[PDB]
Amino acid sequence: ATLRRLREAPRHLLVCEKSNFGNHKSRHRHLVQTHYYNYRVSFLIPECGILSEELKNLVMNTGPYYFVKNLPLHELITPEFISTFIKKGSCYALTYNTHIDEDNTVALLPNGKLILSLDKDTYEETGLQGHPSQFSGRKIMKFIVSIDLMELSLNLDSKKYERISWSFKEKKPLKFDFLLAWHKTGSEESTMMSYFSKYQIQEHQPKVALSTLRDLQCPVLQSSELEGTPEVSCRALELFDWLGAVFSNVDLNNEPNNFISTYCCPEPSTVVAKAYLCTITGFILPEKICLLLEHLCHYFDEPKLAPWVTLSVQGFADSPVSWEKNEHGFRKGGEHLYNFVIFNNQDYWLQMAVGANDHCPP
Amino acid sequence: AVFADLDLRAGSDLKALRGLVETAAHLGYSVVAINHIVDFKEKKQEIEKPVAVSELFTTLPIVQGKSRPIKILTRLTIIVSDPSHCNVLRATSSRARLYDVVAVFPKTEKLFHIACTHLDVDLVCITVTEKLPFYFKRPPINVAIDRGLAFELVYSPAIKDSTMRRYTISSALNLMQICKGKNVIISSAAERPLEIRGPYDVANLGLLFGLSESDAKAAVSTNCRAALLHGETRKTAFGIISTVKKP
Amino acid sequence: AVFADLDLRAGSDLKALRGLVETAAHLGYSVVAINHIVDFKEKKQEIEKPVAVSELFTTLPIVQGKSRPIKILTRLTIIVSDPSHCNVLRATSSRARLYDVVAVFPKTEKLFHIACTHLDVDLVCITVTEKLPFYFKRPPINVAIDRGLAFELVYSPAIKDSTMRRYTISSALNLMQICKGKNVIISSAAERPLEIRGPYDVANLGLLFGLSESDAKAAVSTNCRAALLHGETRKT
Amino acid sequence: PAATYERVVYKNPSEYHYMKVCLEFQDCGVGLNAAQFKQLLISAVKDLFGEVDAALPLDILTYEEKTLSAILRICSSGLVKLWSSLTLLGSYKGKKCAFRVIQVSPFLLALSGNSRELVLD
Amino acid sequence: VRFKHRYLLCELVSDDPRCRLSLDDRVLSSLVRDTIARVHGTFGAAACSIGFAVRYLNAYTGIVLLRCRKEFYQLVWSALPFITYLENKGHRYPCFFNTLHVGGTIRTCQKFLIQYNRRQLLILLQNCTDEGEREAIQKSVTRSCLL
RNA sequence: GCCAGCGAAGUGAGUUCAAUGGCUGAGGUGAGGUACCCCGCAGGGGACCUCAUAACCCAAUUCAGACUACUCUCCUCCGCCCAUU
């Protein structure tokens, strides 16, 4: 019994798909736009030293975002905040450094749903209607309360709105450190530095890390084969593990010594002289990822030396809702990630990496 | 859903205490509970002002996480071997009313029977050092899990020797086989100024013991808060909480 | 489901051979197969009358169990390092048609590739002594398991050293994790007169190697008969 | 030319696990080496859990000297045994070393970017 | 209120019957604990300090019946082949071999021991062909038929 | 109120120094998602993937009934509070 518990499993889900950019059934744009929170956006190009200026201007302008210390939740339900940021664009908000299985974590959706995952104490002290979400077997750990602000903005004199206002203002004042962003889709301009001027708002740019790697042993792929043909093409999952090995700044050969490191490169392969590596780190908007994916699609319009380029996006490992309905849990680790392997004939691979306790979307 | 709650056996001086508090606040901890080892030979009771954390520490410990103020608990671990010393602890239910969690350490099977049966304690200490074999009767364990008794397993055998490691892992496997694993929390001792490992790997130190693949971590994170709850219902009142609130 | 079929590496003299045959018959064995170690340095071929079991043993080995007559096989374990020595083994496919199971021992990854690809062998010997690292490619292992190649793991580090135990358990865990564990049989060598283990103990020792709680015993009891059938179809 | 759509779902194809660990040596006598760390990893699991379980397929990635950080990989069998072996503090000479694990993943990308702090300001 | 015990039989196979005369409960217990401590660590050997114990021993016969737990008999029976190099007053090389693994149930374990002893008697008869042992065999068969 | 035993084979599990609910995969049910297929009433039916299938407890002669300990699960009588017409 215990020996099986020593070696049972952590749960793993790894889903691979292949698709076309010129296909009408392609839902990659919906999958990027309806995915909300993002941390690390990296892209890899083999056999390219000097970056073009058109992509460099897109990389240097992925932000900005804002950080507010100790912001109360009842500021987020005012009609000025709804008519200013929510009704005139895409407003993104998330609490900072509060664990999803331990602490309270509040997120704001562009559809208008403020979704907050609470423990039992905060769910009892606020008194809002929710559903049991995360359990401990027979005991209940974490609840989720969803408040649709767009339906409450139509009737501001309803009993639901004054109930939520009394719960947030006088009943339980909750304050958190918020990361904020607002994609502008409105003719009336109003900055966020002037709105949150009472609290210590800080404007931040995403960190850009550039790398030029030498003598990289990249595998050979076929576009019309996911599982890989024998002795001609490689497997995309071994290529993903090798991708993680390269992004860990680890690229060596067999080293017979006392500290033995056996690592099989995916073969057959091809030596690449220059590998361009870019990593953008911060609160990344998904529309910038949409423009980046369209630029990586249009990069193969000209005859280039790269057979396939890589675009990997790791999201926040501390968010309540990712992949449009799915709950991100923390069972000793686990993350959620999506990768793009873009070929030259407008074909792409959609990978989905799932952590311990999380459901996978199609 | 309160994580980061363990029981420490650590007092030498103020400098080592500050170092252990800074190390626990740095790595993964948000509640520090200090045990005080009292044996049956000395029989001393110094309860009024022995420790004085808040008058000597500087106003806050800062953590790497949510940056919340750490609650600091002062617990008492009483080594009880003689049955008359257990009667002395029976006499302390009305005389001196402090030390929010009272933790008894039994050595006699009749005393362990009346500890789970009649004696009002919070958490029974179970440590096995230097050949202590002990049998387990199941209906007092059933009354204990129905009551709320969380079983403490204070571990530090890895630093001194390996025979102590063997006796602790044998007693812990016997506890996980007989007790069936309902509410057992493990905790680390601190004699040297660095005797603490990572907080997420305490779950695997309990998983080596057994108890589940995940409900080990779930059970320690639930039952330590339930232990603070049991100590609070013993301290304030059994159904009432009365607090002076002057705004 | 033919039980008690393993391989031995044992020839010193007739007395030790009779002792090991009596020990194997008394404890747990019903088919005894004797390997003959031939390295690439000597290059000697003595096939006609080297062993002569039936002319020297006494008419029957008797076991403590079912009391059945033991079939005795004479196998050849050829250590092949040089590619020209593998060409010498290629030349022996039609010259002398004896030694029912031909067991090659590869050391080069290209030689192990052409052993599983083109070279007609029965059971490939895989032993690791004194720092021999070796990788594995998956499509030749797939062609091998589709063909019928059973992988031999000859182990006896238990009396000599502990570092040899470390290298054998590391090679065994690497083989179980890479090869996926389809047809691998483990056997013991006998240099000392007591280098044998239990018949049911092979199951738990392959369980220490891994592969299942049960498929160690299932795989040896199926794949030894499958390997004898494969050697018979190669001979006929 | 080729353009089509296909859905493929796998169940546990990971087969490996990686650990980023930052080393916190107590004393100032830091005589580290790449081979000696491997020898300590072998000698710890031998006395603590077993010599058979010590020769599990493990290796070291990005072994950093001044930063005192490394990555250890083991397949999905002995990850729990590796965690407990590194937990019970196996020593080398008599200077007791604190071995505190930063992060564990089955992926070399989610471990390599950030999982622990997720912003450091 | 009970725990499902497991039991195991092991035969010591060796010549030089000073090895047959050199058996003791404490010596065998310390030997098995020391040879498990080489193979397994604290978790493997300390579970044998509470679960494993000597139960049945015969000097001349060499059949040893030992106990073991439900979650540990695989570890114990995997630790059994690695019992090597018993050092004693002489230079001996004893070695255990498993007969059959019985899932607890001491009564049918003693039943299977009687059939194994009868197989050990009857098969040895025809190959030796000596009357001095055959008279003791006839006496043993007569005493077994008196039972 | 009192008054009646049988030492000889072996319980659709029958052990007693005290065995028997072990692993894998698809379907059942409670749910979610769909870029799959068929039919033309906005839609309906089948197909693909993941999660949950627990706890109470353990038989020594059986059965009937009563008791106490249950919650993945199903048939009903209900109460309170929240929101809508």
Curated annotation (Swiss-Prot), chain A:
The keyword rRNA processing applies. Pfam families: Ribonuc_P_40. Its main location: nucleus. GO terms for biological process: endonucleolytic cleavage in ITS1 to separate SSU-rRNA from 5.8S rRNA and LSU-rRNA from tricistronic rRNA transcript (SSU-rRNA, 5.8S rRNA, LSU-rRNA); tRNA 5'-leader removal. The keyword Disulfide bond does not apply. The lineage of its organism: Eukaryota, Metazoa, Chordata, Craniata, Vertebrata. InterPro entries: RNase_P_Rpp40. This is Ribonuclease P protein subunit p40. Component of ribonuclease P, a ribonucleoprotein complex that generates mature tRNA molecules by cleaving their 5'-ends. Also a component of the MRP ribonuclease complex, which cleaves pre-rRNA sequences. It comes from the Eukaryota. Signal peptide: none annotated. It comes from Homo sapiens. Keywords: Nucleus, RNA-binding, rRNA processing, tRNA processing. The gene is RPP40. It is found in: Nucleus, Nucleolus. One of its GO terms (cellular component) is nucleoplasm. Component of nuclear RNase P and RNase MRP ribonucleoproteins. RNase P consists of a catalytic RNA moiety and about 10 protein subunits; POP1, POP4, POP5, POP7, RPP14, RPP21, RPP25, RPP30, RPP38 and RPP40. Within the RNase P complex, POP1, POP7 and RPP25 form the 'finger' subcomplex, POP5, RPP14, RPP40 and homodimeric RPP30 form the 'palm' subcomplex, and RPP21, POP4 and RPP38 form the 'wrist' subcomplex. All subunits of the RNase P complex interact with the catalytic RNA. Several subunits of RNase P are also part of the RNase MRP complex. GO terms for molecular function: ribonuclease P activity; ribonuclease P RNA binding.
Swiss-Prot record, chain B:
The keyword RNA-binding applies. It holds the Pfam family RNase_P_p30. Keywords: Acetylation, Nucleus, Phosphoprotein, RNA-binding, rRNA processing, tRNA processing. Its main location: nucleus. GO terms for biological process: rRNA processing; tRNA 5'-leader removal; tRNA processing. It comes from the Eukaryota. Component of ribonuclease P, a ribonucleoprotein complex that generates mature tRNA molecules by cleaving their 5'-ends. Also a component of the MRP ribonuclease complex, which cleaves pre-rRNA sequences. Component of nuclear RNase P and RNase MRP ribonucleoproteins. RNase P consists of a catalytic RNA moiety and about 10 protein subunits; POP1, POP4, POP5, POP7, RPP14, RPP21, RPP25, RPP30, RPP38 and RPP40. Within the RNase P complex, POP1, POP7 and RPP25 form the 'finger' subcomplex, POP5, RPP14, RPP40 and homodimeric RPP30 form the 'palm' subcomplex, and RPP21, POP4 and RPP38 form the 'wrist' subcomplex. All subunits of the RNase P complex interact with the catalytic RNA. Several subunits of RNase P are also part of the RNase MRP complex. This is Ribonuclease P protein subunit p30.
Swiss-Prot record, chain D:
PANTHER family: RIBONUCLEASE P PROTEIN SUBUNIT P14 (PTHR15441:SF1). InterPro entries: Pop5/Rpp14/Rnp2-like, Rnp2-like_sf. Belongs to the eukaryotic/archaeal RNase P protein component 2 family. GO terms for biological process: tRNA 5'-leader removal. Its main location: nucleus. This is Ribonuclease P protein subunit p14. It is found in: Nucleus, Nucleolus.
Swiss-Prot record, chain E:
Belongs to the eukaryotic/archaeal RNase P protein component 2 family. Component of ribonuclease P, a protein complex that generates mature tRNA molecules by cleaving their 5'-ends. Also a component of the MRP ribonuclease complex, which cleaves pre-rRNA sequences. It is found in: Nucleus, Nucleolus. The keyword 4Fe-4S does not apply. The lineage of its organism: Eukaryota, Metazoa, Chordata, Craniata, Vertebrata. Keywords: Nucleus, Phosphoprotein, RNA-binding, rRNA processing, tRNA processing. GO terms for molecular function: ribonuclease P activity; ribonuclease P RNA binding. Its main location: nucleus. GO terms for cellular component: multimeric ribonuclease P complex; nucleolar ribonuclease P complex; nucleolus; nucleoplasm; ribonuclease MRP complex. The last C-terminal 19 amino acids are not required for complex association and RNase activity. Pfam families: RNase_P_Rpp14 (PF01900). Component of nuclear RNase P and RNase MRP ribonucleoproteins. RNase P consists of a catalytic RNA moiety and 10 different protein chains; POP1, POP4, POP5, POP7, RPP14, RPP21, RPP25, RPP30, RPP38 and RPP40. Within the RNase P complex, POP1, POP7 and RPP25 form the 'finger' subcomplex, POP5, RPP14, RPP40 and homodimeric RPP30 form the 'palm' subcomplex, and RPP21, POP4 and RPP38 form the 'wrist' subcomplex. All subunits of the RNase P complex interact with the catalytic RNA. Several subunits of RNase P are also part of the RNase MRP complex. Signal peptide: none annotated.
